[PDB]
C-alpha cells in the first residue's frame, strides 16, 4: 500500500 506523512 502506499504511505503518507504529513507532520
Ligand atoms: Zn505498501
Do not use: H, I, R
Not at 500500500?1 to 507532520?7: A, E, I, L, M, R
Amino acid at each position: 500500500g502506499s504511505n503518507q506523512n504529513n507532520f
